[PDB]
Amino acid sequence: WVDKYRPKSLNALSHNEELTNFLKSLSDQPRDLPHLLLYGPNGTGKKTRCMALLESIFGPGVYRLKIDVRQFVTASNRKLELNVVSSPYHLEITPSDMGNNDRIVIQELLKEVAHRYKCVIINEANSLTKDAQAALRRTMEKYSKNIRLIMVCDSMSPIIAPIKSRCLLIRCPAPSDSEISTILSDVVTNERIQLETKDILKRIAQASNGNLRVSLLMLESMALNNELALKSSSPIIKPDWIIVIHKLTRKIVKERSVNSLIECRAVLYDLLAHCIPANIILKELTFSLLDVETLNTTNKSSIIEYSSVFDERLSLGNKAIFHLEGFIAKVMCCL
Amino acid sequence: NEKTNRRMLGWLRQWTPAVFKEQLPLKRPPKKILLLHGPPGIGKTSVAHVIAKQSGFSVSEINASDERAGPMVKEKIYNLLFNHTFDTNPVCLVADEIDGSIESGFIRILVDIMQSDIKATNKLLYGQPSKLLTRPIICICNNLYAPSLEKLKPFCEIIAVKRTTLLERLNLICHKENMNIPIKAINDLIDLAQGDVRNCINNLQFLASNISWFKIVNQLFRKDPHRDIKEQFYELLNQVELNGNSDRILQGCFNIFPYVKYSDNGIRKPANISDWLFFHDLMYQSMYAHNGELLRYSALVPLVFFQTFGDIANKDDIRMKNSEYEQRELKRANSDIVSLIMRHISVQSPLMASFTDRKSLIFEILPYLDSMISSDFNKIRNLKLKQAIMEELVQLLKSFQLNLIQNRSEGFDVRGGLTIDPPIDEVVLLNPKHINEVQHKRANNLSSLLAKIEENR
Amino acid sequence: MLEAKFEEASLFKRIIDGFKDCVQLVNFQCKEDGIIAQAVDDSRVLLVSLEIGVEAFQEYRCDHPVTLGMDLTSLSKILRCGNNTDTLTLIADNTPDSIILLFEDTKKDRIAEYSLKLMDIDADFLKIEELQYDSTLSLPSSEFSKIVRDLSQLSDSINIMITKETIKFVADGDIGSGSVIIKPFVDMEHPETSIKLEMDQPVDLTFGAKYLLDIIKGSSLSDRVGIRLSSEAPALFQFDLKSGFLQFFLAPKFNDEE
Amino acid sequence: MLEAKFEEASLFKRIIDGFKDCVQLVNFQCKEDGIIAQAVDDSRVLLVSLEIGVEAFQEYRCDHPVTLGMDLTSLSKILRCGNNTDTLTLIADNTPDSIILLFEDTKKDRIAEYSLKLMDIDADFLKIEELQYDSTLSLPSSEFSKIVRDLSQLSDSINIMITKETIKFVADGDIGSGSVIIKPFVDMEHPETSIKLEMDQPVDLTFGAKYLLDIIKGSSLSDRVGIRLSSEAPALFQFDLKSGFLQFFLAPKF
Amino acid sequence: CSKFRFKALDASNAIDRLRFISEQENVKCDDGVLERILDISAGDLRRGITLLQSASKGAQYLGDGKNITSTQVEELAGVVPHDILIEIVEKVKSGDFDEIKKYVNTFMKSGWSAASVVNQLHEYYITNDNFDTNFKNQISWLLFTTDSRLNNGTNEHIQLLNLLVKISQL
Amino acid sequence: SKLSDEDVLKRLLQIIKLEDVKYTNDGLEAIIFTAEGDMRQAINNLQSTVAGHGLVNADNVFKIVDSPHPLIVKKMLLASNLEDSIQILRTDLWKKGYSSIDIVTTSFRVTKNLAQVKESVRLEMIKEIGLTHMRILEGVGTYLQLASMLAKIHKLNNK
Numbered sequence A: 001w002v003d004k005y006r007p008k009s010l011n012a013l014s015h016n017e018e019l020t021n022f023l024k025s026l027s028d029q030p031r032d033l034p035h036l037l038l039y040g041p042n043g044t045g046k047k048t049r050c051m052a053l054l055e056s057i058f059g060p061g062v063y064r065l066k067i068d069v070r071q072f073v074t075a076s077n078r079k080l081e082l083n084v085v086s087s088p089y090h091l092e093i094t095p096s097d098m099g100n101n102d103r104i105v106i107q108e109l110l111k112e113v114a115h116r117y118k119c120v121i122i123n124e125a126n127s128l129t130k131d132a133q134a135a136l137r138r139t140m141e142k143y144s145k146n147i148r149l150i151m152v153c154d155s156m157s158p159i160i161a162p163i164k165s166r167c168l169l170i171r172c173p174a175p176s177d178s179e180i181s182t183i184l185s186d187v188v189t190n191e192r193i194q195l196e197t198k199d200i201l202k203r204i205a206q207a208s209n210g211n212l213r214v215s216l217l218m219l220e221s222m223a224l225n226n227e228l229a230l231k232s233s234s235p236i237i238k239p240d241w242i243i244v245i246h247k248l249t250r251k252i253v254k255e256r257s258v259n260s261l262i263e264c265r266a267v268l269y270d271l272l273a274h275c276i277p278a279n280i281i282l283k284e285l286t287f288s289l290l291d292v293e294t295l296n297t298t299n300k301s302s303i304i305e306y307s308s309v310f311d312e313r314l315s316l317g318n319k320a321i322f323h324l325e326g327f328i329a330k331v332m333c334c335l
Numbered sequence B: 001n002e003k004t005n006r007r008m009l010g011w012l013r014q015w016t017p018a019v020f021k022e023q024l025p026l027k028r029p030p031k032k033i034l035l036l037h038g039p040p041g042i043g044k045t046s047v048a049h050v051i052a053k054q055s056g057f058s059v060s061e062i063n064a065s066d067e068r069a070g071p072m073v074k075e076k077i078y079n080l081l082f083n084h085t086f087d088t089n090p091v092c093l094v095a096d097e098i099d100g101s102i103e104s105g106f107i108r109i110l111v112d113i114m115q116s117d118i119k120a121t122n123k124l125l126y127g128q129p130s131k132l133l134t135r136p137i138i139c140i141c142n143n144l145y146a147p148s149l150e151k152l153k154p155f156c157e158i159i160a161v162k163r164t165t166l167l168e169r170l171n172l173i174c175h176k177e178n179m180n181i182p183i184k185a186i187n188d189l190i191d192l193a194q195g196d197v198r199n200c201i202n203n204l205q206f207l208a209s210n211i212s213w214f215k216i217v218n219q220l221f222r223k224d225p226h227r228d229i230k231e232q233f234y235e236l237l238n239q240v241e242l243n244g245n246s247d248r249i250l251q252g253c254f255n256i257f258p259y260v261k262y263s264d265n266g267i268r269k270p271a272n273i274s275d276w277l278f279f280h281d282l283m284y285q286s287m288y289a290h291n292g293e294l295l296r297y298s299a300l301v302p303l304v305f306f307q308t309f310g311d312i313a314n315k316d317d318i319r320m321k322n323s324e325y326e327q328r329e330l331k332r333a334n335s336d337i338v339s340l341i342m343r344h345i346s347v348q349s350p351l352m353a354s355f356t357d358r359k360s361l362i363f364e365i366l367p368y369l370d371s372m373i374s375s376d377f378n379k380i381r382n383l384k385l386k387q388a389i390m391e392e393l394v395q396l397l398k399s400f401q402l403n404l405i406q407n408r409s410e411g412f413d414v415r416g417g418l419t420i421d422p423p424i425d426e427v428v429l430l431n432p433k434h435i436n437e438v439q440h441k442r443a444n445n446l447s448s449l450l451a452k453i454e455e456n457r
Numbered sequence C: 001m002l003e004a005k006f007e008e009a010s011l012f013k014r015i016i017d018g019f020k021d022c023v024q025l026v027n028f029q030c031k032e033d034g035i036i037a038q039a040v041d042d043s044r045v046l047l048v049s050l051e052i053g054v055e056a057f058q059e060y061r062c063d064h065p066v067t068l069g070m071d072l073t074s075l076s077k078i079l080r081c082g083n084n085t086d087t088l089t090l091i092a093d094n095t096p097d098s099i100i101l102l103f104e105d106t107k108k109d110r111i112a113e114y115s116l117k118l119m120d121i122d123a124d125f126l127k128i129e130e131l132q133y134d135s136t137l138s139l140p141s142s143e144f145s146k147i148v149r150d151l152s153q154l155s156d157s158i159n160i161m162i163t164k165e166t167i168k169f170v171a172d173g174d175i176g177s178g179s180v181i182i183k184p185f186v187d188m189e190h191p192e193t194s195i196k197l198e199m200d201q202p203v204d205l206t207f208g209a210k211y212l213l214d215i216i217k218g219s220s221l222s223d224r225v226g227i228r229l230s231s232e233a234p235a236l237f238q239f240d241l242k243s244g245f246l247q248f249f250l251a252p253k254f255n256d257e258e
Numbered sequence D: 001m002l003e004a005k006f007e008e009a010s011l012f013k014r015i016i017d018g019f020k021d022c023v024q025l026v027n028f029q030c031k032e033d034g035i036i037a038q039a040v041d042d043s044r045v046l047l048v049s050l051e052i053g054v055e056a057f058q059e060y061r062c063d064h065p066v067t068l069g070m071d072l073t074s075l076s077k078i079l080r081c082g083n084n085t086d087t088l089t090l091i092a093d094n095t096p097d098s099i100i101l102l103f104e105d106t107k108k109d110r111i112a113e114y115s116l117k118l119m120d121i122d123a124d125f126l127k128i129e130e131l132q133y134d135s136t137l138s139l140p141s142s143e144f145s146k147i148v149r150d151l152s153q154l155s156d157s158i159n160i161m162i163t164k165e166t167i168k169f170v171a172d173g174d175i176g177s178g179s180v181i182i183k184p185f186v187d188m189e190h191p192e193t194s195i196k197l198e199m200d201q202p203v204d205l206t207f208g209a210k211y212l213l214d215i216i217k218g219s220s221l222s223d224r225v226g227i228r229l230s231s232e233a234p235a236l237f238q239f240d241l242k243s244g245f246l247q248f249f250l251a252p253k254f
Numbered sequence E: 001c002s003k004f005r006f007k008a009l010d011a012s013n014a015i016d017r018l019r020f021i022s023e024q025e026n027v028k029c030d031d032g033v034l035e036r037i038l039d040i041s042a043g044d045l046r047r048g049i050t051l052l053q054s055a056s057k058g059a060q061y062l063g064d065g066k067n068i069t070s071t072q073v074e075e076l077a078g079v080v081p082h083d084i085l086i087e088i089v090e091k092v093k094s095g096d097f098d099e100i101k102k103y104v105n106t107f108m109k110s111g112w113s114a115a116s117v118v119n120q121l122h123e124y125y126i127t128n129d130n131f132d133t134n135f136k137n138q139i140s141w142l143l144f145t146t147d148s149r150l151n152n153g154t155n156e157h158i159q160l161l162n163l164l165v166k167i168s169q170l
Numbered sequence F: 001s002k003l004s005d006e007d008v009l010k011r012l013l014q015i016i017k018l019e020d021v022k023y024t025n026d027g028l029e030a031i032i033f034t035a036e037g038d039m040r041q042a043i044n045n046l047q048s049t050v051a052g053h054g055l056v057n058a059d060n061v062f063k064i065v066d067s068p069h070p071l072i073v074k075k076m077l078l079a080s081n082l083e084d085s086i087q088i089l090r091t092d093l094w095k096k097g098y099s100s101i102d103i104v105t106t107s108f109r110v111t112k113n114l115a116q117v118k119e120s121v122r123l124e125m126i127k128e129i130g131l132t133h134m135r136i137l138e139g140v141g142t143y144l145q146l147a148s149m150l151a152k153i154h155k156l157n158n159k
């Protein structure tokens, strides 16, 4: 399992040695530490490295944490309920658990909270609205001797420039397939899995695209289908939504009409209704449509242009299906 | 509807021996309630009133949608059915909008009155040595298959009113006011008033002294071949502006356009309209940020549908619904389930919560967790390996705080299905075919997992 | 089991008035030497702690301690039936799902009985009281209430400063600043109006006015209030009862901490 | 400088209660013969004017007049610390940025001191009082309050009409009409209950009930109220103090 | 209000402040480090001071007693190395849609900010005196459109792939 | 309904006869033109011109009152060449103190109510006037945005 085998310190990290050394350098003197922003691909291990860095800044009790609840009152009598992950040395907030009320929670909670300082971990800073980021802009600078922010995100694209300047930027590159294979080897020798040939582990990496969280989960999922004994040709366990997207692309390249557009809209609705973001849906749909060998360069260029345009539309809109169906119709018109 | 009006009169005349003691155990009609159904505005209420008055009854009307106190109303209905009115004429009860009664109080009272009268009649027929219903009841609905009416239907004589009666009524008013109105101008007034009887009478009185957003959506897909396209466009613009609800009209257009017939070359028309729809979504987001000067441009986006998809082929009205409110409520419910799972992980898994984003939880973690729980343990011959997997699954159920609840809502002592709380199934299972397969497999696994959780407890 | 009869329902009603508003959940525990109760607000800056000895009751029987948690709001909602002069008996079995409040008039006449649903709260009573505080002072509680009510209008923070023979309350905000200075004094004409002060070390702490306002409610339970301050711990404001006391421990503001 | 000590903080608290609500800004000025204060509401239909002579104080010292403006709301917020029986001293230097209110109990015990921030207001005291008014009348202020409280319920306008030996208050609105008629009379059993009236000319003026309601507050300062009416100017309602008075000038309707 | 426009703090008008900060903290660096730091800052003294503090911490942890190098600074500043950018130029110049897409998918595995990659590509294409002016107008407009799209919170992978594909067709 | 030219002219003639005012035909024509079926506005402009200059002449009416804002905007949008529309926008609207918001909003109204051109080109012009608007409301309201809007409208009209 991902959680049973996870590093708890900086000396327990097993990939990106230069990043581990940079973290040790940054944690050598912990009091004169500026705000940090960990950015990189999703599933690389930045949330583990931030906790490992906190374990170097403070005692080992940083992992002994508790979940509490805090209530807030907006301009109306609608009560905002937010759970907080707290520790005797730091606290974690995730403003991605609500709508446009991120600014209120951010400002009030950070003002109440504001070695000698208490660390703050803002999870998924990409969901932070521009108004919440503007509110945090001055809170980052006014209280710099009591509150230090460690913002974990997957892409600095939606982060405003003032926030980017107000904190150090640390990139976490996805681990190489060799390091993923070495980690899976230790996992299967500790979990007592039977490998007929080691190369299958490499293939797992080649199916994860640098994601360790996905790699270990897929390894464990396929270890339950092969009954704790992986063979030389064990099938690759793909998530359900990926299969739905692949079938959607097959339907797209097979039939291009309005009658098929209706069932495409139905599939998009069924995907969106089951807690699947539309940006990831669009990304996977476009990337798997480019993989269609039936199309040519002229089709793929138009497809990527339309996907960029409708990604901008979706980032500027709120009704996600209104942009997804438009992108699908434009792709149908292109092919 | 003369045939229907004569049937109603025939049914009310069957009450005459019981009420008036006139010769055509009480010789009452077998069905004591008359149920009128049909479209709005066709005169259901007017026909009930005229036929009851023509039969010598005093008419008492009750709107069943407004009377939110059946148990209280009860006193009104009981007084109107069983007490003598000061009027010489027997009362006929007319209940309008009986399908609008969200609280079954009114209908339960009518059913209780009918059951009490059946018990009282059987005592008069078979009783060796109780208020009998002596007054007719007319009920009016728009929808016959409304769930509330299922209990009332067996006691009712059902009469369908189909889509002239307004013209006849207005002519009778004109003749009594000594107004010589040509029948053409009365038809034009009926068409102007859209079958509103109150508006018709007021417009007639004014002459004497001298668009549902759905209808707009269906009009936006229609082109009249006999009128200038520009005149049709300005008429539609004025109708969209007067309605003030451009958003609902556009959502209507968005639901209708895939089902509409439109000369298709490559389905590009839909690609051009996705850009407008995106323009509308940006405009609608900006309305909450900026003073509503931008509201004037909101009426233009629905008119792009008339330009692009308007065709002479679209003669039939397409009915519509609100998939978005249902999808928004479902998205809210699923987000609340996910937020509760994320809180449970934060309380138990001290480190897991730091690596779990809401999106990664929905798309990666929950589908694998459900596939692990739904796996067919019956294929595993090795008992030791089955026990080890079940111990790991019990540890996973504990890390995610997933409780196995015996839903004993079966009600007939056979198989109370085991359900996971929170229901991960509603978030993960998008495919209706996979739901049925997974439910049958899970029922046997969850009983084995519950037995193991109880053993561990 | 729980079996505690108050002579006058009024005493219990005033005690609960003290927990009222500032806390939501209260954890009671009855035992051989009486009843104790603790409640902590959500921000964890205020602890309300009660102790009622056996002698405060007209009848008390306990052969087996019982711990029970409940919603304060639910309790007060029910705590206005005492007629003040009514007799009140708190009753509960050894493994309760509810707490029974029984109000009776002298004569058999009228009997109001309630069965309040309990909440499960992890038993974890705090014992944060100190051996010695930097400074200790007592003064009439009505005087303390006025002092708090004055300053509250000026700021969300009220500072208490103690130096030899001097106690000074200060508030400073938008409209200006205010201060109330009091001096120790023994009034023999009636010592319940005296102002005592024992200072081992000068102190200077700031508290959130909203909390001091919650605390002043104790005036209704005692003529005097004891205030114990330290730079090492939450301040203690105490209101004595006949056999018992109601205590409020309030954490000083760090710079911004209630 | 400003240095005025009131025997009982209560007097000042009741005086300020009179400006309360109906005005936001008040301009005070202390000088050799006492303290005056003026406040005008936003619509400019009501002027509240105060005068407290030197003798109303237990101690008053002024060698240099000081004018100071302040927010009424801020002042009242602070004006509930007087214990009524507390002693109150108003203090300010010759070029103040604040006004100090000092409440002290007889014994050295408790000293509540406030430092209220001042507002800069262009000094422009009005002198709109008339030599002669068409009619003048006085009656118990509690009676005037009742009269106003009665009629207020009926309309937003209350008319006062005066003819020889007759004073009539009238309100007429949606639910109907009402009137209160009073007649002049000398009660020797206690003349503080008498109703005097001197009419040089019959008068008939209408006032906004919301304003008369603000004015009745003066009852707490005096047993009687004097009302002076004219068709040429704002009406004057006056509440006498020991050495001083609180006056309300109200402009009639159209 | 009187409008006061604050100018960007490039190397010229901020080298004195950066050198003062370095001397006050005994930041032993090479000749062209500070001027390079502001060059990465693009008119932002706060980001430059943060980068200088990070470089000083990384040089004090090592304890080798050497001077900070421009390469060590641009490594922690999020700047793509020159060789990786030259590989992108080769893939854009010579290569089809499939090879470019595969290389972009591989490059997005290593965490780099798309804004920095776009800025470096713009600098390389506009500065290199080996492309036609007609190509330069198109590359400038494409980079402008890509930056404007990236400034709205879009997906970096899709935008970068679209930009590279559009500039490869030139 | 709106008041035709004859009715407002008759009412103004009656008022002039009742007030003994010096007037001329072109002045009354300009008054009625600037009134746009608004009798109250017509009488107000007449009284203002009388009290400001004494003689009701077209020159005085035009120097005291503004030529219907929408008509200059219509003439600007209906221009055939880009330079003519640019010069009109510069001299008539921008050099006289008309705010960009008023120009774009008046522009939207003129287009919506236009009948000279077809429906599709009108919708495209409204789209361009509105995308610009979205920039005008964000505080980017300048002359360059209106110039680009006019250029895009002409490009749409450029087949």
Ligand SMILES: Nc1ncnc2c1ncn2[C@@H]1O[C@H](COP(=O)(O)OP(=O)(O)O)[C@@H](O)[C@H]1O
Pocket: A002, A003, A005, A006, A007, A012, A013, A014, A015, A042, A043, A044, A045, A046, A047, A048, A049, A183, A211, A212, A213, A214, A216, B354, B355, B356
């Ligand atoms: N140093 C490391 N060595 C081995 N595995 C690691 C290391 N750091 C993280 N992992 C594991 O790799 C995966 C990374 O995914 P995840 O933890 O979700 O990433 P993040 O920390 O960025 O949220 C997890 O299974 C995590 O436990």
